[PDB]
């Protein structure tokens, strides 16, 4: 489709991020003086319209809240419809926080760019949780860099050159999943390794388990790879299990997933192929820290509180917000 114009203004110049929904792709606007925007454009099928219509209902009530995007979520500037796809006109951002990983060759982001991404998601997200939404799908993908301008120099520690961001401001971006507290909540949410325990279990969830996916994607930032190198839902327990301890009891009790326990407990052999897989991927989480100095072991006291078992336990935004990790940037 580059070189098609949509609602006779915008034409298709590039294909910018891909998915279950459609595309999202830079367009000429040759109605402003030629610059670039993004355009979302939906599948005409019906599943992704209504999480499309979702998505404008969302964005307009937070652009309307928050104008100038504060809080940084993306900004809608217009929708309409074209051949029966939905179209959702967005500020042109950068390349995704996983984009830049990939092409940086998987070398995780500096502890100082850490603290100002986490700052800035968890500012983001706060405001949803803030106003009776759940985000439900975070994830690498969906957060953006403003600018994805990098300086360049060579790192004599690795042998290599390596690309850093000049301003590493993001934006989240994707509202076609995100509930409001009295809508209905979909049975399964979320991107396999950045889904919350309550999810996997069924329990039901609201506002914490985008916390869970925050601390999944933190590590990501920190190590440049998942802890959770999985596909299946009883492994991906087990390496739960093996990186934070036994899940709580009472979890187990309430859960009718009843073919992932035996007894009260995990029905894993850590004897067969995939024990030996977790065992050898998985690791009780303190271990992965690259250092053992004060500002690594408060952004990991901040994860290990984001990646409490039990909802009702975990750490909220507004409390992440205060925590000493964030200091630095005072
Ligand atoms: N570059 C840019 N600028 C503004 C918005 C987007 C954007 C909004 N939603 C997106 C989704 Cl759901 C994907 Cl998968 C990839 C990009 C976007 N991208």
Same mark, same amino acid.
């Given at each position: 489709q580059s070189g098609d114009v949509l609602s006779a203004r915008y034409e298709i110049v590039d294909t910018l991020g891909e998915g279950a929904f459609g595309k999202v792709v830079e =367009?000429?606007?040759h109605k402003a003086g030629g610059r670039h925007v993004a355009v979302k454009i939906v599948k005409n099928?019906?599943? $992704?319209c209504?999480?499309?219509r979702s998505e404008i209902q969302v964005l307009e009530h937070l652009n309307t809240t928050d104008p100038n995007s504060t809080f940084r979520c993306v900004q809608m500037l217009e929708w309409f419809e074209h051949h029966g796809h939905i179209c959702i006109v967005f500020e042109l951002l950068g390349l995704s926080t996983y984009d830049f990983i990939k092409e940086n060759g998987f070398l995780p982001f500096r502890l100082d760019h850490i603290r100002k991404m986490?700052?800035?998601? =968890? #500012?983001?997200?706060?405001?949803?949780?803030?106003? #009776?939404?759940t985000h439900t799908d975070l994830k690498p993908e969906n957060i953006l860099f403003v600018q994805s301008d990098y300086t360049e120099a060579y790192n004599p520690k690795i042998k290599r050159?390596?690309?850093?961001?000049?301003?590493?401001?993001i934006k989240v971006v994707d509202f076609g999943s995100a509930t409001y507290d009295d809508e209905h909540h979909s049975t399964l949410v979320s991107t396999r390794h950045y889904r919350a325990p309550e999810v996997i279990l069924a329990l039901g969830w609201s506002q914490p388990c985008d916390v869970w996916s925050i601390g999944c994607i933190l590590i990501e930032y920190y190590l440049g790879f998942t802890v959770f190198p999985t596909h299946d839902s009883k492994e991906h327990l087990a390496m739960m299990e093996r990186i934070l301890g036994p899940l709580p009891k009472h979890m187990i009790?309430?859960?009718? *997933?009843? *073919? $992932? /326990?035996?007894?009260?407990?995990? !029905?894993? !052999?850590?004897?067969?192929?995939?024990?030996?897989?977790?065992s050898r991927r998985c690791k009780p989480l303190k271990? /992965?820290?690259?250092?053992? !100095?004060?500002e690594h072991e408060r952004l990991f006291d901040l994860?290990? #509180?984001?990646?409490?078992?039990?909802?009702?336990?975990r750490i909220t935004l507004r409390e992440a917000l205060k925590h000493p990790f964030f200091d630095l940037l005072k």
């Amino acid at each position: 489709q580059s070189g098609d114009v949509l609602s006779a203004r915008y034409e298709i110049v590039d294909t910018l991020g891909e998915g279950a929904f459609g595309k999202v792709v830079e =367009c000429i606007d040759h109605k402003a003086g030629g610059r670039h925007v993004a355009v979302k454009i939906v599948k005409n099928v019906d599943r $992704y319209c209504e999480a499309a219509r979702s998505e404008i209902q969302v964005l307009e009530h937070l652009n309307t809240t928050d104008p100038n995007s504060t809080f940084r979520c993306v900004q809608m500037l217009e929708w309409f419809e074209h051949h029966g796809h939905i179209c959702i006109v967005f500020e042109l951002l950068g390349l995704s926080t996983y984009d830049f990983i990939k092409e940086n060759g998987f070398l995780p982001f500096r502890l100082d760019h850490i603290r100002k991404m986490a700052y800035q998601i =968890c #500012k983001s997200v706060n405001f949803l949780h803030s106003n #009776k939404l759940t985000h439900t799908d975070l994830k690498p993908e969906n957060i953006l860099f403003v600018q994805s301008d990098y300086t360049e120099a060579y790192n004599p520690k690795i042998k290599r050159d390596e690309r850093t961001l000049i301003n590493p401001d993001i934006k989240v971006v994707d509202f076609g999943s995100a509930t409001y507290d009295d809508e209905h909540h979909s049975t399964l949410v979320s991107t396999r390794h950045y889904r919350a325990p309550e999810v996997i279990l069924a329990l039901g969830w609201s506002q914490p388990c985008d916390v869970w996916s925050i601390g999944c994607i933190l590590i990501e930032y920190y190590l440049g790879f998942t802890v959770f190198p999985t596909h299946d839902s009883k492994e991906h327990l087990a390496m739960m299990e093996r990186i934070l301890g036994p899940l709580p009891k009472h979890m187990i009790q309430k859960t009718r *997933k009843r *073919k $992932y /326990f035996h007894h009260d407990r995990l !029905d894993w !052999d850590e004897h067969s192929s995939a024990g030996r897989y977790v065992s050898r991927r998985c690791k009780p989480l303190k271990e /992965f820290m690259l250092s053992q !100095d004060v500002e690594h072991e408060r952004l990991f006291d901040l994860i290990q #509180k984001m990646l409490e078992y039990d909802p009702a336990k975990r750490i909220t935004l507004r409390e992440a917000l205060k925590h000493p990790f964030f200091d630095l940037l005072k």
